[PDB]
């Protein structure tokens, strides 16, 4: 017979082009969710409630069951644990903090109140993902490159906080391709060699040369570049023996040999996702992208490549 | 009644300093132990078994039940995989590995076999630790101050591998007081800011100066300094209301206000305890001090001194 369920409610803290872009168009489709409130110091959204703080919020909003925290990870800790203090589910955008620690936190915090917690990783949910995954899983492999080249010029016009120490450089946009690479891998991998290459300003890399290992020794090749002006590259190419597996377009596109065997619902997919947690009772924190991310910075030779204006 | 029990058969993987001073003599005195092979290219123990190499010594010894492996964390995976492959407990040298990455890696496999791991930290087991645990845990905090500055030069004469990519340079000893902190203070801490200082030439730093906070707030300053030629510094100083807690000499002694409240069993201490996970079937791999490492890599500011000879 037919179970009813009434919605999760959802409240929203942060602001930005991710809120605007992404996240309320995929909460206006999901019919799982009611958005009941925002907060933010920087703008409302028309006809729901707004508060300045989400203290504030929390107070005066006690149906809320969940909420997604928008802002980048600087600021994100204290929300987070406001919202899991509270009993709140809690969506937190990628990565799911500046540190490992702060997140490891949260996830002590979050079992401790019985709320599911949530490190989404948007590329993970590109729609060749799962196939690639499936593949790969039925197959010998022999090698991995991930090829994750864009211009910056593009894509960050004019911005500072990527060169912060904090900010993450090109592991910013290369964390995405980690977070694909951890999920399509049969075995875990970790970072066996890297090569850190930095402007002299600012205090974050432009580049990034790291090698990777399994347990079977399976080589992993990575390389991310801020400087790819022509020729836009999202890829992770697999040699196997069934015989070479291509994903391009961030996770969007699977060429089987040359096969090219869906549209982009990375955002729908997440709160889906976070739907799915929630009801089952479970969190949902894989760190492995962001792990490597560290990895990378404690084991990389820091080399010096010019300026950046 | 009384409770008869067989000893756990030990095996050593590695040789060195840590070995001779350390790790045999510990041997020699813990009853719960039989030293009964060692494995390396590079020495013997007069009237153990030897062998070359671990998967030598494994086949050779079925009744082998623990490993303890001290080697660098740089060649230590893949004896620390064989190991837990064949269903040995494993005692792993500090740090526990390279990466966090393979780290996490080994803890899954030895799960999954049931066999205990252990990420040894000497320092957490100096004579004064519990001692100052359990008072900060009766107290209240306010600020608290790590001081560990030493001498390279005294400490590490003319040694290559610190300064490599990945070597950790003064987190090396860095760790120690890390680990201290970790077990030390009531709630968990996380990196809310850094500076790394490096040398030109080589690619890892000579000092750091880190901050953190707990949830509630509470500050800690951490410095770490390699160029202390003068009075050698291992401290960590607690404000509280209370009224100030001193730990000095790498968690040997304890001065309360000035009442300056047993001798170094570091090593005898990490045996007792790896009798004891073994014998309760668990795993005790707390890698919060490298995560901390980590996080300072990944937040530092990267600072540029001078050279080094």
């Given at each position: ?23 309320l ?64 589910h ?45 593949f ?68 974050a ?49 699977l ?46 030779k820091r ?7």
């Amino acid at each position: 017979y037919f179970q009813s369920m009434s919605p999760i409610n959802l409240a929203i803290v942060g602001v930005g082009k991710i809120v605007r872009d992404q996240h309320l168009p995929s909460i206006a489709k999901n019919a799982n969710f009611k958005l009941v409130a925002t907060a933010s110091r920087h703008g409302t959204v028309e006809g729901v409630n707004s508060y300045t703080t989400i203290e504030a919020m929390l107070d005066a909003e006690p149906s809320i069951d969940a909420v997604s925290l928008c802002m980048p990870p600087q600021y994100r800790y204290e929300a987070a644990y406001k919202a899991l203090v509270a009993g709140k589910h809690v969506f937190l955008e990628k990565p799911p903090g500046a540190t490992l620690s702060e997140v490891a936190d949260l996830e002590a915090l979050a079992n401790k109140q019985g709320a599911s917690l949530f490190a989404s990783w948007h590329s993970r949910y590109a729609p060749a993902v799962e196939a690639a995954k499936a593949f790969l899983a039925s197959t010998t492999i022999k090698s991995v490159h991930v090829i994750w080249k864009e211009d910056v010029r593009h894509w960050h016009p004019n911005q500072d906080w990527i060169w912060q120490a904090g900010g993450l450089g090109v592991f910013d946009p290369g964390i995405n391709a980690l977070s694909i690479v951890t999920h399509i891998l049969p075995r875990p991998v970790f970072i066996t060699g890297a090569v850190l290459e930095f402007p002299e300003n600012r205090d974050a890399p432009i580049a990034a040369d790291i090698h990777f290992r399994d347990a079977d020794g399976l080589p992993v090749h990575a390389e991310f570049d801020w400087r790819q002006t022509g020729k836009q590259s999202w890829d992770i190419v697999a040699e196997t023996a069934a015989g070479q597996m291509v994903l391009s377009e961030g996770g969007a596109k699977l060429s089987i040999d040359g096969r090219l065997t869906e549209p982009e619902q990375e955002y729908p997919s997440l709160y889906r996702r976070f739907a799915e947690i929630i009801k089952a009772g479970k969190s949902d924190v894989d760190v492995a992208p962001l792990r490597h991310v560290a990895d990378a910075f404690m084991l990389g030779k820091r080399k010096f490549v010019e300026a950046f204006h």
